[PDB]
Symmetry: D2
Subunit: 462 residues, 4 copies
């Protein structure tokens, strides 16, 4: 049994929903059809680390339709949809993912995507959050300097470092030998891409990487419109709270915060925003959101949402000040946005899976969602299929490009060229009935672009 | 065992959520506290027929805190939250309610709320949708004229009429004897209140009734803001569909449609509305919604929502014309808004509980939600606690008024007086930090109201 | 010359805008066509007191096209569009109105509408604000008891009482003789309707009156959608201020206030609301507006709008607390919502017409718009033709009904019947392409209404 | 007299609006204060071509307060606020601008800004639309090759080429000698920036240029939030039209189009969008706008707005298909977005200044605003002071940088550095009460940025 999932019997259900998702994911479906004859991913062995949702399942089977062999884990302990995992396993793909797996299991699963049978090796990583990339790179450092895994500072590191030891005892060259085969990585999210840029700035990036997050059709769609639908979806499945009339504070006003702000406002919440970037602060103010400090908000707001990709944006003292039954969640990639660890000293009382009461010594309780893990994937199902098709069409193009032409790329982070970004968006217009217009020759000459595009300069912000 | 619920072990969970709901239902909590000394519902035996949600559980225990003895059923086969039912049963109240009960069970449960031990009788009905009221009134007619239950036209009637026969065999005077004890009814929803007005117009209303639906603080809050949060909540738990970019058609633009329209629009759907009332049509047009016929929409839209309280607003031919994987739901009180029965000839395939594919002969499938039953309660948890407190504070006041002073009322439908409607709203202002201002004497004289209110004439529409 | 306007040479311009307005006012065009053959207003001599705008112009000519003879004045010193007045005069109707007329000129003009030649008398009043009606009623009381005009409380009353004295000296029976000839009044605004209810309550109302404000198609349209467009229109023409990022406080959350709030919010203002009505306050809070006191708001907010119909909602001390270049305006009917009189002790500096700096002793200045008079009409053109067609279609039907059938009505305040309200709405659907659907026979029977309507019970709030 | 304005007597009014504007433009006030001691623009002789509004007035005086000597013209024939021009002249700056100037006057005025007394020369251009820069470049080319001014394609070019001929006859070296003295250009609008990129591409750019349009704080603010306020402002002053219920089509969904769409939607319009860029089209569709062709829209829509920066987006046949009293306007930089020339074959009837009826042969009329010139500036006052402060703070910094350090830049198009973009934003926070939060040391290390910023990578799109 080359997989670990919750219950293989959930497969029928997963498949019914994969069927539906295809009709909602025209980018993936049209890319299957365009490229299946060519079989461009034949000989690709893709280790994927990414929320094992129905949406990811349509991606996985797109990669396979194009010839890839694939092994998959989730990039969060709570993001898996078990019926998605089951259907993908049933259709022949190794998946090491279930909702609620432990941290030790998580990291073990990150190794398993790198354990191919019959002497083969993964030669591509599809990463969301940089954990698969991290594991190989940190594991390899550890081979030559055990000190890099000696001093864990948090439970994530205890688990990661432990799993590395465990693998180094088995084979002293476990990581470096697998690293050597990786042709490149395609990375989905802002936090992951941040990790790649830091490796680039440091000269420790050992292969080419695509930054899929910053395709226009990704950052400005998925991060934004996707959270605009799924933040509240997560909060409500967790708590069934009324939004109208509440004071919701969104920490961070990038694309994820913009989406979050917009969905809370739409339902009649008073929306406050917190920011360190004055440009983004001014944008928030220009939409009518009050821009405040977290210290100012902690004792006043009803709902707190971290969307920063930063560390300890909600800390012990913010939570100590909150009103009784304040709801606290994180929609950023990592749970460290909230100092959950500092509340463990207090008595907790579980309400239901992923909804916990933290009881402070004066009896005041905070309702914490998904133990701080991404709330949309943890209490709901993450973004809907339609917008996820943008991100995953990008992913599929990036995987094709690196597998087929990676030799043309240096050890740098790249973004897909604008013409492909434009293609991704174009493939989604028909599903929703949008009629694209066409430049006349005279018009094309007048604004200095080709009728076929690209239509915008490379610094354009959309 | 004087109850029927899914699983008594869900009680702990139900109670945790009732605890939270109290902090979200300041109207109910403050009314408990104001009246508990007086015990105004001492000697009240309230038969309730109403969605057995967490929110209803806080209502039930408010009635009990005020001295009522209570027996409860749900007013929809799919609206029960089983953990709510379990906690209320565990705290000592007979509940005949579970999610997914059959139609025969439904109507049997409607009898059970009328079966009190030790020779007692219910003397108050708390009704949502008019089913408890209907049962006693139709049962009593049946006693003298069996022809009124002879010719059922639909599965609801087959079940109702069967359950009446079954009870008339036991006791030929089953209904009339129980009817004789009812001091009055308080009725929660537009469809229920419509049934009461028809009985009034016909002179078959045998006791006083309160129309709780048309308290301003009910119709204009619950129906409107409540659907503004829970329609999409239901659609997404069912289907996880993206709303942005879809064409959503809302049939009906009363308070329920207004709320629905507003939440679809907020998430970036193109919203079309259907109406028979030109005033409401013009309101919809004034918000930017295209007002179209269902015949025009059927082959074009992505998501269909009936919010009319009417019959067959989506019929066999509309559904036959729909695009593949169109989502069809109803948020009106009764499932007859959609002619579900006309699709039974086709092959169905269940996706998950309350989400079904209807496969037309050309292979095109429609995704029907909750078999047409109210989608917010059926695929989600109905309105959130906060707005439900308005409706239920109203309910509690209406029950107090009829139990204590029903002798002062004729056999007519009444609405609560404006001063109480205003009180209901006032009790909710503190939770959300709204600061009410006060008229000066000069101001009170100038606009001709008392400083204490009421502030508006009786025809005011808010 | 039987008129007083600013400039007759503006007529050509007014006529061109009247042509355009007709295509924006389908209710009035269709009513002219429907009733042309009958000439129901033949023999009607209508005295009108209503903002002399392009829109009122189309109303005047509709009344004349149905047979009425008309004389007109504006119901505000700053709301006349002089090109409108000119075009209406040039086409044969006496008009006594110009933008910027003094208060003495105002009340002289309200007498002129009651000075018909050849020994004739007005037999109908069409009023907005109730000033035409007040003139004749107060004047008649003054004939027998001068004490009623002994105690003016503001400049408008000083001017009104002077005008009554002056006319009484010419003819001690000037008012009573004209008052006797009035067969009915149609009153279209909330403040005037309050004045009429107040008269009915005290047995002082001598002819039948229609409350046109409380047609659904007036109140819930003109007051709301109109101010949603015209409030910012007025403030911008006056000040050209950015709305995005500002704190805007709306005093009063009735229909006008709802419109104002929604307008300011859409441009990215933070919208605060002030209310004495807890229901209206809870509505505001459910849209995400903060509900605060004026004392709280005075030293924080950027823009202040009064929308109450009440007295001294912004007082001296509020203004003294305001930030430099705070903008203060009123959109309610009378300027007394703001205590402008209390600021006359300070230096003022005119910025441009209807835009003044009030210079406080510390050098802090407040920007007051239109000396507190209704800002949308004073600094812009009021509501647009389209929505006004609703109100004026109601007015036209109201006039027809009282003039032709007034004998059947008591000396009380009436509202138009629902079927007529629905007609008003229906007449406006085609222009905006809204398609009304039609009940089937079964559907009509199912909800217990006729196919032709009316569709809602009289208490329905829409 | 070294100026040409409509009326010097309007100065007092302009000065009072300049005082107010200063309190709305904190970036410009703070920049004057920060750089007053240094006088960085001492010795700068700035020729400006930019809408002569109150806002540009504050910019002019900011430049003068930092030492610059200035001469100014408007960059559009209809966008001057004459009270603004008057107040700027009265305070000592030559201005050659008035609302309604002819095209011959326009281009004569663009020469006058380059006629400095006492043998001096402009050494900086501040341009909006690129007309000042075009004048000198084209003119210099014309000195050696008259064929470049042989083939005008529209009336503005006819007038431009006439003006070049005329000046060449006086001095065959008129342009080249002035062109040599230009040390730099700062260009603030998208169309002018396109003209500059086009010049760099062809080796024809003879001095360093700043693209100020593409400061985040310009493009994503002025173009968007400005048009969200000023588009409807312009259309309403021109036509007073109801927006609610109308179909409004926005050609182009760049920053301007996004602003326009959002404005129209907020007032209850049905908003359709036209786009040739599939990404911009998908963004529009994700807000619920229908994406349609102009051919589709022409006979259906009520209001048409061009926002493309392209040519002949509304053509003759579009206008011929339009409904009676369709409203047509343009908000892009040049009027050629609409083919107004093709309508001159028809009778026109002026309604009022910048509002014309185009009378078609079947009697159908179209309302054209401002002869196709930018409608917000032509029929209203453009964007409000607050947002313009962003753009003009960018302009001021751009001028300082090129004048003081221009020698370090190549003859290429540059953008301001992010830290300066952030500063612009930061300067505007206090006025609107937005509180910026500050990274802790660990947080700064965690996301790899400095506490002082900049906070985002150069590709960040906001
Ligand atoms: N849960 C999801 O489905 C989802 C979807 C997309 C991206 N993400 C993740 O969400 C996070 C945010 O992504 P993004 O694309 O918006 O990134 P972003 O960089 O565009 O936005 C982050 C913002 O947070 C602000 N910020 C940083 N530290 C702050 C602090 N201490 N206080 C207040 N603001 C602070 C920054 O100014 C920045 O604008 C990332 O971790 C990303 O991987 C999650
Ligand atoms: N699911 C929930 O949580 C919820 C909440 C409150 C009320 N309700 C129920 O929802 C239904 C609607 O309630 P409401 O308060 O909005 O009633 P309403 O009377 O205010 O609105 C119904 C609207 O439907 C329109 N209509 C009737 N027949 C139509 C047809 N064939 N096509 C198009 N429009 C038609 C009417 O013109 C009317 O405006 C009722 O059955 C009520 O009991 C449900
Ligand atoms: N400018 C216009 O084009 C326009 C249009 C329609 C009506 N009006 C006028 O606007 C005014 C309001 O009309 P409406 O239809 O909204 O009336 P409304 O009665 O519906 O609303 C007024 C609201 O003000 C509140 N209020 C009263 N005093 C207050 C105070 N001291 N502080 C805070 N809130 C207070 C009331 O509680 C009420 O909800 C009237 O004078 C009416 O004639 C103006
Ligand atoms: N009036 C103002 O106050 C104001 C303010 C800022 C900018 N502008 C001007 O507005 C214009 C647009 O500026 P922007 O910043 O939005 O530019 P942009 O490049 O960001 O947007 C223009 C959009 O138009 C689309 N387009 C081009 N041709 C089209 C066609 N034939 N049909 C449909 N869509 C088409 C492009 O694809 C692009 O997305 C420019 O001329 C600019 O100088 C005016
Ligand atoms: N969470 C909830 N708990 C109890 N009742 C709820 C509910 N959500 C909706 N409702 C109610 O359903 C009615 C329509 O049957 C409506 O009148 C009323 O809103």
């Amino acid at each position: 049994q080359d997989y670990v999932v919750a219950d293989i019997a959930l497969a029928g259900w997963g498949r019914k929903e994969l069927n539906i998702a295809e009709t909602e994911m025209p980018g993936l479906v049209q890319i299957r059809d365009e490229y299946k004859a060519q079989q461009p991913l034949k000989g690709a062995r893709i280790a994927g680390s990414l929320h094992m949702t129905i949406q990811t399942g349509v991606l996985i089977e797109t990669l396979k339709a194009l010839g890839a062999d694939v092994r998959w884990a989730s990039c969060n302990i709570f993001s898996t949809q078990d019926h998605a995992a089951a259907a993908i396993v049933e259709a022949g793909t190794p998946v090491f993912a279930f909702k609620g797996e432990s941290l030790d299991e998580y990291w073990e699963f990150s190794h398993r995507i790198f354990e191919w049978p019959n002497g083969e090796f993964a030669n591509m990583i599809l990463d969301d959050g940089g954990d698969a990339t991290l594991l190989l790179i940190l594991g390899s450092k550890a081979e030559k300097d055990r000190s890099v895994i000696a001093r864990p500072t948090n439970e994530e590191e205890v688990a990661l470092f432990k799993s590395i030891e465990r693998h180094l005892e088995i084979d002293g060259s476990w990581y470096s030998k697998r690293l050597a085969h990786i042709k490149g990585v395609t990375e989905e999210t802002t936090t992951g891409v941040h990790r790649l840029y830091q490796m680039e700035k440091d000269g420790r990036l050992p292969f080419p990487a695509f930054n899929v997050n910053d395709s226009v059709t990704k950052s400005k769609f998925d991060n934004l419109y996707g959270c605009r639908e799924s933040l509240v979806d997560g909060i409500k499945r967790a708590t069934d709270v009324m939004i109208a009339g509440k004071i919701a504070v969104v920490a961070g006003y990038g694309d994820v915060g913009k989406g979050c702000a917009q969905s809370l406002r739409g339902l009649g919440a008073t929306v406050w925003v917190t920011e360190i970037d004055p440009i983004c602060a001014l944008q928030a103010a220009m939409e009518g959101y009050r821009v405040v400090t977290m210290e100012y908000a902690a004792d006043k707001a009803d709902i707190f949402v971290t969307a920063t990709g930063n560390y300890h944006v909600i800390n012990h003292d913010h939570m100590k000040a909150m009103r009784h039954n304040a709801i606290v969640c994180n929609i950023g990639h990592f749970d460290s946005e909230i100092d959950v660890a500092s509340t463990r000293q207090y008595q907790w009382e579980n309400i239901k899976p992923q909804v916990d009461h933290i009881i402070f010594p004066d009896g005041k309780r905070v309702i914490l969602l998904a133990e701080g893990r991404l709330v949309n994937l943890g209490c709901a199902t993450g973004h809907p299929s339609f917008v996820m098709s943008n991100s995953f069409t990008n992913q599929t193009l990036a995987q094709i490009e690196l597998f087929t032409r990676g030799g043309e790329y240096a050890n740098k982070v790249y973004v897909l060229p604008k013409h492909l970004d434009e293609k991704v968006a174009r493939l989604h217009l028909a599903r929703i009935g949008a009629q694209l217009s066409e430049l006349s020759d005279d018009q094309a000459a007048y604004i200095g672009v080709s009728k076929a595009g690209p239509f915008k300069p490379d610094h354009y912000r959309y």
